[PDB]
Coordinates of C-alpha atoms (C1' of nucleotides) in Angstrom, one line a residue:
Chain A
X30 CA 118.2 103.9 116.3
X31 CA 116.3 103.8 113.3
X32 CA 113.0 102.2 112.5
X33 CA 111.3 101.5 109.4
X34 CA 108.1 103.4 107.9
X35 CA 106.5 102.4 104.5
X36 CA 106.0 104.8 102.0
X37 CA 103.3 104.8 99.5
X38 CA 104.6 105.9 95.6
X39 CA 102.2 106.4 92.2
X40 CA 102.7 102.5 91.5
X41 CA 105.2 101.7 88.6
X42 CA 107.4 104.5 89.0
X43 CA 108.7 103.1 92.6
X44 CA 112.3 102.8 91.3
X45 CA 112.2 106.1 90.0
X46 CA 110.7 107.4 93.4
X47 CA 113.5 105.3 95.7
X48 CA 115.9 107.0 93.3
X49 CA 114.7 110.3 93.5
X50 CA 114.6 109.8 97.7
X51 CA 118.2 108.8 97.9
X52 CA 119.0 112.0 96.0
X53 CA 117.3 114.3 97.6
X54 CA 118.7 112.7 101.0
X55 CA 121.8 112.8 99.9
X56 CA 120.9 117.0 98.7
X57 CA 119.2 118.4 102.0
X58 CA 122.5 116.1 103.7
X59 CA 120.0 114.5 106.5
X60 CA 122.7 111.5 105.5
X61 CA 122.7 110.7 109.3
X62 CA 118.4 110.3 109.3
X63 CA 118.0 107.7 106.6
X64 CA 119.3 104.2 106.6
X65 CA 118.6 102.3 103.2
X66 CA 115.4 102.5 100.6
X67 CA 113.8 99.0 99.7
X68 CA 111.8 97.9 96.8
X69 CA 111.9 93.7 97.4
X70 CA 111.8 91.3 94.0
X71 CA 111.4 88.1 93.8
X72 CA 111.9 86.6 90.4
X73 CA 107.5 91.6 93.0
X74 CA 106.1 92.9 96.1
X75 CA 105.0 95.2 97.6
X76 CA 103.0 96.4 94.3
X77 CA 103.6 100.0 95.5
X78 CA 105.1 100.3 98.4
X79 CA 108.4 101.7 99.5
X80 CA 110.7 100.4 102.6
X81 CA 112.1 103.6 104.4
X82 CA 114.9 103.1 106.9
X83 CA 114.5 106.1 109.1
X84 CA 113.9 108.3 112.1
X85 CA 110.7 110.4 113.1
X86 CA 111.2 114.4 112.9
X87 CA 108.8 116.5 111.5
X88 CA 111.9 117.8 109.3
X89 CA 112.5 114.1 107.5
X90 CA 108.6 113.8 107.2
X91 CA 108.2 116.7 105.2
X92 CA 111.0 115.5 103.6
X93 CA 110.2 112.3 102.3
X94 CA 106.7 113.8 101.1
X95 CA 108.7 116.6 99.2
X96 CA 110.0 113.9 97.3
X97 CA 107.9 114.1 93.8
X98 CA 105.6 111.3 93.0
X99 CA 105.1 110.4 96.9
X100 CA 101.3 110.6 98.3
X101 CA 102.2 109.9 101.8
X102 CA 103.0 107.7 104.7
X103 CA 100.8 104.6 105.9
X104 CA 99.8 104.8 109.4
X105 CA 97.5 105.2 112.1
X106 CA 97.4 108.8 112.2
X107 CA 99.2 111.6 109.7
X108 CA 100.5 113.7 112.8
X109 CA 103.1 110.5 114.3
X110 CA 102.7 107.9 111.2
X111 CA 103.2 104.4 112.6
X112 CA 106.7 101.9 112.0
X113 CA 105.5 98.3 111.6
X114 CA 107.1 95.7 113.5
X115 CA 110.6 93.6 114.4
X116 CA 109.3 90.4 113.4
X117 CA 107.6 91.9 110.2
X118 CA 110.7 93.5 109.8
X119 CA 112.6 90.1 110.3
X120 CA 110.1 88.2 107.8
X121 CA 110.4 90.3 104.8
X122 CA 114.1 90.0 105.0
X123 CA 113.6 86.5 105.1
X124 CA 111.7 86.4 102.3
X125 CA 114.3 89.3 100.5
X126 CA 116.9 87.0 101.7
X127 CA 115.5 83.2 100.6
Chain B
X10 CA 86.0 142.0 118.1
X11 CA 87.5 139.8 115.5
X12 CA 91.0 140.4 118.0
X13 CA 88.8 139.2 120.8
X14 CA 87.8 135.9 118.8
X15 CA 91.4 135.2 117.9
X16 CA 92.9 132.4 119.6
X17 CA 96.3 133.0 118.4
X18 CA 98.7 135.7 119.8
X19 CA 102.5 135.9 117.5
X20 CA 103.1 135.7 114.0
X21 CA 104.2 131.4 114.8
X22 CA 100.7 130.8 115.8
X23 CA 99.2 132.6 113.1
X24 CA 101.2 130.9 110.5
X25 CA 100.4 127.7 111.9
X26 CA 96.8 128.1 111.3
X27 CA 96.6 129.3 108.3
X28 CA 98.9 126.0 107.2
X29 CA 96.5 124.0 109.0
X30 CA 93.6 125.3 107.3
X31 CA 95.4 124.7 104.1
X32 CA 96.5 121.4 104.5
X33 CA 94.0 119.7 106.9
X34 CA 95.4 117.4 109.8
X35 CA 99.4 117.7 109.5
X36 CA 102.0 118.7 111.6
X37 CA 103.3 121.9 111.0
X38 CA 106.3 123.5 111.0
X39 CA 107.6 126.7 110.9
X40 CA 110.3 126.6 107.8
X41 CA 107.1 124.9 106.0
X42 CA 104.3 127.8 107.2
X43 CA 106.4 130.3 106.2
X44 CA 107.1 128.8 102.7
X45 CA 103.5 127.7 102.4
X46 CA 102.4 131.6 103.3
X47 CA 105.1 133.2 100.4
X48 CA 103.7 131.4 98.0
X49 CA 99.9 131.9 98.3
X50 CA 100.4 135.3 97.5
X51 CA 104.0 136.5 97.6
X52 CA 106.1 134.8 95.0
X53 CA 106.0 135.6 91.4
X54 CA 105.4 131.7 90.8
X55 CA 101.8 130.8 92.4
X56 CA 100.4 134.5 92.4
X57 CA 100.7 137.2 89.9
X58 CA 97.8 139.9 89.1
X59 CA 98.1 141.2 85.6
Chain C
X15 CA 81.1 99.9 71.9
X16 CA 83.1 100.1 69.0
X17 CA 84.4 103.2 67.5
X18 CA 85.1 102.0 64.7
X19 CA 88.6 103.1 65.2
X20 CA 90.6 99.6 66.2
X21 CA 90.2 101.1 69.5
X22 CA 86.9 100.3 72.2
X23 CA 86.2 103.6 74.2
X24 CA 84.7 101.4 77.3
X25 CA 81.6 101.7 79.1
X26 CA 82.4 103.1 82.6
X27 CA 81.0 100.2 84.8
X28 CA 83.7 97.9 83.0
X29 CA 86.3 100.0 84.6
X30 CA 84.7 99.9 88.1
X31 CA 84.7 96.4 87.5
X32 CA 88.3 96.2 86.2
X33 CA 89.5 98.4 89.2
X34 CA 87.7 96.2 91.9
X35 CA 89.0 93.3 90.4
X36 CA 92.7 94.6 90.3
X37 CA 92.5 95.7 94.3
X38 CA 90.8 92.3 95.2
X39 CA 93.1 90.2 93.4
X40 CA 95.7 92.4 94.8
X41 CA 94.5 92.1 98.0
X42 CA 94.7 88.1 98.4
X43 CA 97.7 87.9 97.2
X44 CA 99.2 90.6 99.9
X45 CA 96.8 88.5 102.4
X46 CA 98.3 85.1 100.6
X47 CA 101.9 86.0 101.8
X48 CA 101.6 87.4 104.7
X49 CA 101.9 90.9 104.3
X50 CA 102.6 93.5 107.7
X51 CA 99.2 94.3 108.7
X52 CA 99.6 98.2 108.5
X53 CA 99.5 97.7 104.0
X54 CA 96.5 95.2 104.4
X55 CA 94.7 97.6 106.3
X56 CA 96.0 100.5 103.4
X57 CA 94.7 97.9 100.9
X58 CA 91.6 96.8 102.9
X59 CA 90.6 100.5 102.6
X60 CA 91.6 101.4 98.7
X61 CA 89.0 97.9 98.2
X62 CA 86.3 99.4 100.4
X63 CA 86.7 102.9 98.5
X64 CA 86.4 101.5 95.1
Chain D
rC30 C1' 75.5 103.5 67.3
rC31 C1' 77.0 104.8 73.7
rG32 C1' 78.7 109.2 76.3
rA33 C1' 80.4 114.1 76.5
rG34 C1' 80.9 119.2 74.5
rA35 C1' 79.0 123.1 71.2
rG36 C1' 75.4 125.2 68.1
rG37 C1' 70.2 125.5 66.3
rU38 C1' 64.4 124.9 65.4
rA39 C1' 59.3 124.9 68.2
Chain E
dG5 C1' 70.8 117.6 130.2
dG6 C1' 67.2 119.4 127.3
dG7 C1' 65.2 123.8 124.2
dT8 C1' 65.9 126.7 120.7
dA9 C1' 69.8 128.3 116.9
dT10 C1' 73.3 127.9 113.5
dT11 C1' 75.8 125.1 110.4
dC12 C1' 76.4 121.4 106.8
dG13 C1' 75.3 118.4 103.3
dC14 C1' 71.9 116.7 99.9
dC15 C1' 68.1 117.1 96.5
dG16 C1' 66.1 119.3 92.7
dT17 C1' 65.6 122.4 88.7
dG18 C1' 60.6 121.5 80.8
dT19 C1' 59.6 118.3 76.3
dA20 C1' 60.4 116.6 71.4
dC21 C1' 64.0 117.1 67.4
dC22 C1' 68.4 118.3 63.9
dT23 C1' 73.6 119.1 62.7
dC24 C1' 78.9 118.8 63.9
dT25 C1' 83.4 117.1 66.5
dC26 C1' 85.8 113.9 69.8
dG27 C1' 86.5 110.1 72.8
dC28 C1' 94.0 107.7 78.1
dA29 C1' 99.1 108.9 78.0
dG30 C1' 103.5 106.7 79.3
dC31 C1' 107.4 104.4 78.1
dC32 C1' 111.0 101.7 79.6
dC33 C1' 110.3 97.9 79.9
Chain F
dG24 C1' 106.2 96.3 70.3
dG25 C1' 102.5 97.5 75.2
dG26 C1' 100.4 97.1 80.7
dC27 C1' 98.1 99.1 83.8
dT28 C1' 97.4 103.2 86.6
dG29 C1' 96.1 107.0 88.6
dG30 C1' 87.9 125.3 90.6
dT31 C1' 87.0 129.6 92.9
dG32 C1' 79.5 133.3 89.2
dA33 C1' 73.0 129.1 91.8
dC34 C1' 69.5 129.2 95.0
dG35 C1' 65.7 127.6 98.0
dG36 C1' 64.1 123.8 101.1
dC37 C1' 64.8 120.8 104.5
dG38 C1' 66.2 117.8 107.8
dA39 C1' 70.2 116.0 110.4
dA40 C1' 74.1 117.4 113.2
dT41 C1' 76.2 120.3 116.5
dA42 C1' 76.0 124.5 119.9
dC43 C1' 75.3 127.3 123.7
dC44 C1' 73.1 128.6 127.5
dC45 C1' 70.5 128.1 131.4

RNA sequence: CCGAGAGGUA
DNA sequence: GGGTATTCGCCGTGTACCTCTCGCAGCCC
DNA sequence: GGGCTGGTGACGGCGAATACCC
């Protein structure tokens, strides 16, 4: 099961960062510890944030900050950063999805 | 004396201090001490004396 | 001032100004629609620190 | 016509 | 459960004046 | 055309915040 973290990029390169993630996923081959990457638009927030689908090891975590142009993740602590909700979850994709 | 104020006791532990005194308030691990402690002074990148 | 260039080197409280303006603005509208509480805290704090 | 940085006189 | 000791951050360091240069890039929306 | 976005050479005083020790 994996849960979602947010992900905080130098804000106005977020589709170069979200690229950048999904390549070096797809180079360290963690393929089955990373679900999607979203940056929602309407015709855009979040003005900085990135939406990680993912799972908690200290191996993905240093991971997604050795992506370049990533300060950190955004969560109660920086030792086990924090996931956000199901029905925050379920309201941005309605939002993503109206 | 400075062995009997050590805390630590294997090269892991050591490591793991010396990345936590780097980077303040982050878990550690040991792929990332050891790269973190070969290139403070170790590497021809980050260190180099002329 | 002007430089006399076509170009105004500002003053530095108009930045301050212009950089709490940008997070507060920012900040309703992430409060507006109904952001997950964990990036209104973030931007709570980024307000608070400029 | 404000701030930096450098130099100089007493 | 306080009485001394060590750390940790802040606060501060002369007055007038003259000349010169240089003051935010990036970039793909 | 243009928006907006994020070092490692000072030293003394002094008081507030731990500390350790009984």
């Amino acid at each position: 099961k994996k849960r979602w973290y947010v992900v905080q990029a130098f804000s106005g390169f977020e589709g170069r960062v979200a690229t950048s993630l999904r390549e070096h996923i797809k180079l360290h081959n963690m393929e089955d510890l990373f679900g999607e990457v979203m940056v929602p638009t309407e015709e855009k927030f979040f003005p900085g944030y990135v939406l990680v689908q993912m799972v908690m090891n200290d191996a993905s975590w240093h991971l997604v900050r050795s992506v370049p142009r990533v300060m950190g993740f955004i969560g109660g602590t920086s030792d086990r950063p924090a996931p956000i909700s199901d029905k925050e979850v379920d309201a941005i994709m309605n939002r993503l999805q109206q | 004396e400075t062995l009997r104020v050590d805390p630590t006791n294997d090269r892991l532990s050591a490591l793991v201090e010396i990345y936590r005194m780097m980077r303040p308030g982050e878990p550690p691990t040991r792929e990332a001490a050891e790269s973190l402690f070969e290139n403070l002074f170790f590497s021809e990148d980050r260190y180099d004396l002329s | 001032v002007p430089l006399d260039g076509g170009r105004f080197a500002t003053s530095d409280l108009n930045d301050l100004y212009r950089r709490v303006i940008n997070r507060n603005n920012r900040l309703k509208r992430l409060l507006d629609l109904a952001a997950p509480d964990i990036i209104v805290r973030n931007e709570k704090r980024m307000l608070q620190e400029a």
